[PDB]
Structures are given as C-alpha cells and as structure tokens.
C-alpha cells in the first residue's frame, strides 16, 4: 500500500501537463492529441507501432494530466470515448486480423471510432435492443437507429450492439464493428447540447447494412458482456479527464479568492467562500483516490465493477458540484463566458448521464454489495 508514482509515471504526468498549452470539430487538436499518444496509451506495440501499452494506472494518470491542462474537455471526452469504448473492445474481442487491420489507425487517431448502443427506447435499460442483426451466409444484415452517438458525425467505424436472438434475452446480443462506408448508414447533424461542444453527438441509422462476419466482436450472443466490459474501461478511465478538470477548477478558485477583494479583504477571508473551497478540495482528493483505487483494482483480475461504479459516480457528482461552486466563488464573472469558468458545470452535467446515469451506478453498486 503506497501512493508513490515512479519517476517515469511522474515524467509522463508532467509531459501531459505541459501538452495542454500546445492546443466545427477541432480536427487539428484531435491530430495533435494523436501525435502526443492519447489514443495509443493502452494499445500494445504488437498492434500499433507507437502504441504505448501502458498499464491502467499510468494511462489514467496521463489522462488526468491532460484533463487538467487541456481546457477543451469535450475534445478529451471524444478521444476517450473512441479509445475506451471502441479501441479496447476491439483489442479484447476482435479476431487477430481485425486487430491488425483496425488498431494501427485507431491508435494514432487517423481513423475515429464511435460507440453505438443507446436507442429511442433503450437508454439506462439496454436489455431490449430494437437494432437487429440477421445472419446471411458469411454476412450480417444490421437494421436500426442509434440515438446518441458520441463522434457519430466523424466516425470511421461504429461499434454497434444489436439483437441477434430475442429469445436468448441478455445473452442474445452481439457486437459488430461497422465501417462508415457501409451502404445504408445515415447520420444526423451534430446535436446542439448543453456542453462538450467538441464531442459530436448524433443520431445514426443503419438501414439494412451488410457487413462481413469477420467484423463481429466476440461470438454471437456475447454483446451484453462485451458492452459491460467496454463500460468497465470507459467508466474507469474516461472519468480521469474530470478529476484533472476539477484540479483546474480548484486552482482557479484559490487564485481568485486570494486576489479578488470585497471591502478591503480578499474574499478568501469569508468562510462562506473559503469553506466552500475547502470542500472542493476534499471532494477532489476523494474522487482522485477512488479513481486510483478503481484503476489499480481493474489491474488485479477481481470483480472491480463496484470500485469503478463508485469512482464514476463520485467523480461525475464532484464535477457537477465543482462547476457550480466555481461559479459561486467567481460571482458574475463566473457567469460570463469570458470568466472561463462556466464550461465546468455545462460539461459536468453530461458526465452524470453518459456511461450510465448516477442512478445506474448506484444500481450496480447495490448489486455488488449483494443487495437483493
């Protein structure tokens, strides 16, 4: 039991912190993150030439550093959705041929992947997917709409979860990598939404899309469990972004409360302000430790789902409180867009919905506690 980072891990973290300043869809910044190595952090060299094959802790520490120094949270979020919800299930469940075909360009960001499971009637409950996949010889025909696809408009591939056998319920779904050029894909314009402007969100329709069976991830019927495994990656690693974003919020509030004066004292001298900041620091230390613990536990081959769900919940909830408290501390200036504070709340409110709402995280926690 220790909280010490290796010299190498510290170096990588400092490298991530410095990279932030070097920064329609911000394609140039996406490619810059590609060159930095963001999309290749957890990809083995075996599958991508400059894939770092980092362990989970090193990977989350670098992501945290980027979440701290890169103010475009939405962009980091797009990148993490691509890496953890798409590249990782490909790595874990793709044939060797699919992995060599897809991972090199995923790893550099030259090609972009989007995760597609939610539908018009499937959100928190994904037990009954209206999107179907029918076997026809060596091919599957995919049919259905996916309603909130991050990276929908920019995606070169969709990881799509579809019902292959209604009667097998939970074990009746299958995962497929669907190339963008497959006839029958249409994508709506990017939604206008509260935050995370750099991460496109789109409706995607699959109208009798034919794909070769080698594009299936895992076996027929494994869809639900592969999706669970990809959410284990995403809920764990993607949320490292917001722990960094919260360190930034906190740093900004401390600076401001030490600089801004009202009636001849810094506002730091009012406990309504300073004790508010103290609680941002508390909730942040807590969320960061929970992340580190979930990432460590995920590396131990035990069921780490409880720790991951607790971390996702604590980070995303702390991030909403951080966004609100930063505005409070900054006053009217925080309400103004030029205050450069009000993106935290807009982005944070996304983080308690995507990857499973807070209510779903508590469902998972309750289940892992053994509650009937």
């Amino acid at each position: 039991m220790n909280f010490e980072w290796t010299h190498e891990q510290a170096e990588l973290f400092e490298h991530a912190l410095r990279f932030g300043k070097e920064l329609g869809f911000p394609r140039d910044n996406w490619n810059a993150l590609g060159d930095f190595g963001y999309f290749g952090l957890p990809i083995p060299e075996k599958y991508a030439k400059d894939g770092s094959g980092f362990d989970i802790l090193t990977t989350i520490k670098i992501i945290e550093g980027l979440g701290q120094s890169c103010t475009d949270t939405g962009l980091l979020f797009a990148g993490a959705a691509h890496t953890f919800a798409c590249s990782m299930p490909i790595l874990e469940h793709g044939s060797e041929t699919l992995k060599h075909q897809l991972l090199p360009d995923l790893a550099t960001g030259r090609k972009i992947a989007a995760n597609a499971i939610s539908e018009a009637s499937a959100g928190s409950d994904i037990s009954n997917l209206a999107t179907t996949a029918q076997k026809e010889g060596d091919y599957y025909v995919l049919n259905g709409g996916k309603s909130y696809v991050t990276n929908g408009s920019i995606a070169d591939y969709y990881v799509v979860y579809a019902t292959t056998n209604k009667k097998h319920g939970y074990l009746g779904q299958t995962a497929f990598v669907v190339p963008r050029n497959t006839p029958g894909i249409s994508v709506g314009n990017d939604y206008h939404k509260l935050g995370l402007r750099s991460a496109p969100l789109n409706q995607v329709f699959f109208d009798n899309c034919t794909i070769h069976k080698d594009y299936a991830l895992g076996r027929e019927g494994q869809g639900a469990r592969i999706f669970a495994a990809s959410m284990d990656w995403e809920r764990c690693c993607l949320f490292a972004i917001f722990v960094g974003a919260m360190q930034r919020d906190l740093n900004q509030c401390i600076e401001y409360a030490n600089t801004r004066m009202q009636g001849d004292k810094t506002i730091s001298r009012f406990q309504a302000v300073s004790h508010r900041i103290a609680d941002m620091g508390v909730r942040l230390e807590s969320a960061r430790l929970m992340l580190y613990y979930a990432a460590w536990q995920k590396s131990q081959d035990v069921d780490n789902t409880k720790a991951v769900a607790m971390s996702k919940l604590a980070i995303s909830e702390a991030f909403v409180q951080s966004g609100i408290d930063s505005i409070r501390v900054h006053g009217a200036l925080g309400y103004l867009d030029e205050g450069r504070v009000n993106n935290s709340i807009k982005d944070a409110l996304g983080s308690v919905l995507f990857s499973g709402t807070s209510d779903i995280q508590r469902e998972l926690i309750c289940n892992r506690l053994g509650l009937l």
């Binding site: 037990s127 319920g169 939970y170 074990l171 069921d303 289940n367 053994g370």
Partner: protein, 71 residues
C-alpha cells in the same frame, strides 16, 4: 432453484421449475447473473469460465445444473 425463487424473484413465480426459460423470460440479466454466479461459487465451489456463459447453459435450471456438474 430455491435460490432463484427467493433471492432473484422473491415474491411469487411459484410456478418456477427446472424448465422455466431463464433468459427468455428475463429472469437472468446482467444484475441477477452476478448474484447467481456468486451463489454458484459459494454453494458449489464452481467459478463459471467466461466461455461457458451462453444461451445453451443458461437456458433453464436443468441446463445450468448440467454445466455446474460438468465443472
């Protein structure tokens, strides 16, 4: 079987037997599977390999019992 009725279904489903289609009727899902797998580990010493979680074995209590025997 007592287990599925008490822990998973609690109230009613007193018609439950070794032929009830567990997957098809939604009795076994992502959450109930976790509890079932823990019970199987506790009660029988068996940790079901990932390859073995499929519609053949989890069709019903009879087929599931068959898998636990094999293991």
């Amino acid at each position: 079987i007592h287990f599925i009725n008490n822990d998973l279904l609690e109230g009613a489903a007193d018609d439950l037997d070794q032929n009830t289609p567990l997957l098809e009727l939604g009795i076994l899902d992502s959450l109930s599977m976790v509890l079932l797998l823990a019970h199987i580990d506790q009660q029988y010493g068996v940790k079901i390999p990932e390859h073995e979680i499929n519609p053949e074995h989890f069709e019903n209590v009879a087929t599931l019992a068959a898998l636990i025997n094999q293991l």
